[PDB]
PDB file of C-alpha atoms and ligand atoms in Angstrom:
ATOM      1  CA  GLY A   1      -9.276  50.528 -34.170  1.00 59.11           C
ATOM      2  CA  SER A   2      -7.668  47.650 -32.687  1.00 62.48           C
ATOM      3  CA  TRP A   3      -8.572  44.265 -31.004  1.00 61.22           C
ATOM      4  CA  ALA A   4      -7.330  45.617 -27.796  1.00 60.86           C
ATOM      5  CA  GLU A   5      -9.192  48.766 -27.966  1.00 58.96           C
ATOM      6  CA  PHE A   6     -12.538  46.765 -28.844  1.00 59.14           C
ATOM      7  CA  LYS A   7     -11.947  44.567 -25.676  1.00 61.88           C
ATOM      8  CA  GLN A   8     -11.493  47.726 -23.646  1.00 62.13           C
ATOM      9  CA  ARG A   9     -14.739  49.363 -24.931  1.00 62.09           C
ATOM     10  CA  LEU A  10     -16.835  46.059 -24.614  1.00 61.84           C
ATOM     11  CA  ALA A  11     -15.641  45.972 -21.099  1.00 61.85           C
ATOM     12  CA  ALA A  12     -16.927  49.736 -20.562  1.00 61.32           C
ATOM     13  CA  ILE A  13     -20.372  48.391 -22.054  1.00 59.04           C
ATOM     14  CA  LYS A  14     -20.310  45.505 -19.675  1.00 60.26           C
ATOM     15  CA  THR A  15     -19.663  47.985 -16.710  1.00 61.00           C
ATOM     16  CA  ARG A  16     -22.801  49.741 -17.922  1.00 63.94           C
ATOM     17  CA  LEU A  17     -25.063  46.951 -17.831  1.00 63.05           C
ATOM     18  CA  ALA A  18     -23.730  45.941 -14.375  1.00 64.37           C
ATOM     19  CA  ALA A  19     -24.538  49.616 -13.413  1.00 65.77           C
ATOM     20  CA  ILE A  20     -28.089  49.474 -14.780  1.00 64.97           C
ATOM     21  CA  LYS A  21     -28.644  46.213 -12.754  1.00 67.71           C
ATOM     22  CA  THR A  22     -27.263  47.749  -9.379  1.00 69.49           C
ATOM     23  CA  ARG A  23     -29.417  50.739  -9.926  1.00 70.13           C
ATOM     24  CA  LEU A  24     -32.594  48.605 -10.630  1.00 70.54           C
ATOM     25  CA  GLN A  25     -32.417  48.324  -6.615  1.00 68.73           C
ATOM     26  CA  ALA A  26     -33.204  52.139  -6.519  1.00 67.32           C
ATOM     27  CA  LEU A  27     -36.855  51.283  -7.712  1.00 70.22           C
ATOM     28  CA  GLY A  28     -39.874  50.529  -5.755  1.00 70.01           C
ATOM     29  CA  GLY A  29     -41.129  53.630  -4.222  1.00 71.26           C
ATOM     30  CA  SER A  30     -43.133  54.798  -7.471  1.00 72.08           C
ATOM     31  CA  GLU A  31     -43.880  53.841 -10.943  1.00 70.48           C
ATOM     32  CA  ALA A  32     -43.316  57.270 -12.671  1.00 69.59           C
ATOM     33  CA  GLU A  33     -39.611  57.081 -12.066  1.00 68.78           C
ATOM     34  CA  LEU A  34     -39.365  54.229 -14.362  1.00 69.88           C
ATOM     35  CA  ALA A  35     -39.897  56.411 -17.699  1.00 67.96           C
ATOM     36  CA  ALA A  36     -36.533  57.938 -17.339  1.00 68.29           C
ATOM     37  CA  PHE A  37     -34.711  54.811 -16.848  1.00 65.40           C
ATOM     38  CA  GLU A  38     -36.376  53.247 -19.807  1.00 66.89           C
ATOM     39  CA  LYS A  39     -35.191  56.090 -22.021  1.00 66.75           C
ATOM     40  CA  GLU A  40     -31.674  55.745 -20.524  1.00 66.86           C
ATOM     41  CA  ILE A  41     -31.810  51.983 -21.234  1.00 67.14           C
ATOM     42  CA  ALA A  42     -32.857  52.708 -25.092  1.00 69.29           C
ATOM     43  CA  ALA A  43     -30.163  55.083 -25.305  1.00 69.15           C
ATOM     44  CA  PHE A  44     -27.422  52.296 -23.979  1.00 70.45           C
ATOM     45  CA  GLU A  45     -29.220  50.062 -26.645  1.00 72.36           C
ATOM     46  CA  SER A  46     -28.484  52.514 -29.367  1.00 72.34           C
ATOM     47  CA  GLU A  47     -25.038  53.015 -28.079  1.00 70.33           C
ATOM     48  CA  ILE A  48     -24.294  49.166 -28.098  1.00 71.60           C
ATOM     49  CA  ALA A  49     -25.885  48.996 -31.759  1.00 66.83           C
ATOM     50  CA  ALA A  50     -23.369  51.607 -32.848  1.00 65.99           C
ATOM     51  CA  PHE A  51     -20.433  49.633 -31.271  1.00 66.87           C
ATOM     52  CA  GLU A  52     -22.011  46.491 -33.465  1.00 69.68           C
ATOM     53  CA  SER A  53     -21.927  48.640 -36.632  1.00 70.10           C
ATOM     54  CA  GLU A  54     -18.210  49.860 -35.932  1.00 70.50           C
ATOM     55  CA  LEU A  55     -17.095  46.205 -35.518  1.00 68.91           C
ATOM     56  CA  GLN A  56     -18.972  45.314 -38.707  1.00 71.67           C
ATOM     57  CA  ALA A  57     -17.001  48.046 -40.456  1.00 74.53           C
ATOM     58  CA  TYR A  58     -13.906  46.681 -39.118  1.00 74.92           C
ATOM     59  CA  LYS A  59     -14.577  43.393 -40.223  1.00 73.62           C
ATOM     60  CA  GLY A  60     -15.209  45.074 -43.775  1.00 75.73           C
ATOM     61  CA  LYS A  61     -11.413  45.773 -43.778  1.00 77.08           C
ATOM     62  CA  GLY A  62     -10.776  42.101 -43.534  1.00 75.95           C
ATOM     63  CA  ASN A  63     -11.003  41.085 -40.276  1.00 75.15           C
ATOM     64  CA  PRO A  64     -13.371  38.077 -39.567  1.00 76.95           C
ATOM     65  CA  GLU A  65     -12.111  37.620 -35.935  1.00 78.53           C
ATOM     66  CA  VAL A  66     -14.050  40.292 -34.600  1.00 78.66           C
ATOM     67  CA  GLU A  67     -17.605  38.408 -34.920  1.00 80.10           C
ATOM     68  CA  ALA A  68     -16.679  37.178 -31.435  1.00 80.50           C
ATOM     69  CA  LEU A  69     -16.831  40.841 -29.983  1.00 74.46           C
ATOM     70  CA  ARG A  70     -19.964  41.670 -32.148  1.00 76.27           C
ATOM     71  CA  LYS A  71     -22.036  38.482 -30.962  1.00 77.96           C
ATOM     72  CA  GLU A  72     -20.979  39.481 -27.254  1.00 77.51           C
ATOM     73  CA  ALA A  73     -21.951  43.148 -27.721  1.00 80.80           C
ATOM     74  CA  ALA A  74     -25.460  42.058 -29.498  1.00 83.59           C
ATOM     75  CA  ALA A  75     -25.937  39.830 -26.319  1.00 85.55           C
ATOM     76  CA  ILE A  76     -25.483  42.747 -23.891  1.00 87.99           C
ATOM     77  CA  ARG A  77     -27.886  44.706 -25.969  1.00 86.16           C
ATOM     78  CA  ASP A  78     -30.610  42.014 -25.736  1.00 84.87           C
ATOM     79  CA  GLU A  79     -30.087  41.852 -21.972  1.00 83.93           C
ATOM     80  CA  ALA A  80     -30.630  45.659 -21.780  1.00 82.49           C
ATOM     81  CA  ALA A  81     -34.026  45.623 -23.910  1.00 82.88           C
ATOM     82  CA  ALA A  82     -35.301  42.813 -21.871  1.00 83.00           C
ATOM     83  CA  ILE A  83     -34.918  44.855 -18.810  1.00 84.04           C
ATOM     84  CA  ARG A  84     -36.253  47.951 -20.456  1.00 83.53           C
ATOM     85  CA  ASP A  85     -39.234  45.923 -21.571  1.00 88.59           C
ATOM     86  CA  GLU A  86     -40.043  44.619 -18.074  1.00 89.89           C
ATOM     87  CA  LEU A  87     -39.869  48.218 -16.671  1.00 88.53           C
ATOM     88  CA  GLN A  88     -42.377  49.556 -19.395  1.00 88.54           C
ATOM     89  CA  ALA A  89     -44.905  46.854 -18.284  1.00 88.76           C
ATOM     90  CA  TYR A  90     -44.661  47.585 -14.617  1.00 93.47           C
ATOM     91  CA  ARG A  91     -44.937  51.468 -15.078  1.00 91.54           C
ATOM     92  CA  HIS A  92     -48.136  51.012 -16.892  1.00 93.23           C
ATOM     93  CA  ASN A  93     -49.642  48.098 -14.693  1.00 94.02           C
TER      94      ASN A  93
HETATM   95 CL1   CL B   1     -24.780  54.735 -13.476  1.00 94.15          CL
HETATM   96 ZN1   ZN B   2     -10.323  54.770 -30.977  1.00 92.58          ZN
HETATM   97 ZN1   ZN B   3     -29.572  55.805  -7.172  1.00 93.99          ZN
END
């Protein structure tokens, strides 16, 4: 890995969070459609957690500077998890 590559793949994760936010605007007509979206957001959280782990392994080669990128990735995972929690609650009333 490299700093430039981790910044690029973090930017790709940011685009994915923005896409989830845009696609919340497709919801309203019915609650049953939220299950697939919740499963998709949980898969996104797993994808981000795997990226935090990869960054920690790069830190493990003697590169403390990557903590800035790990903090940002974990904040995105927290935002995604907060959105999934709200959909689950709405789907079940
Ligand atoms: Cl999409
Ligand atoms: Zn690579
Ligand atoms: Zn759509």
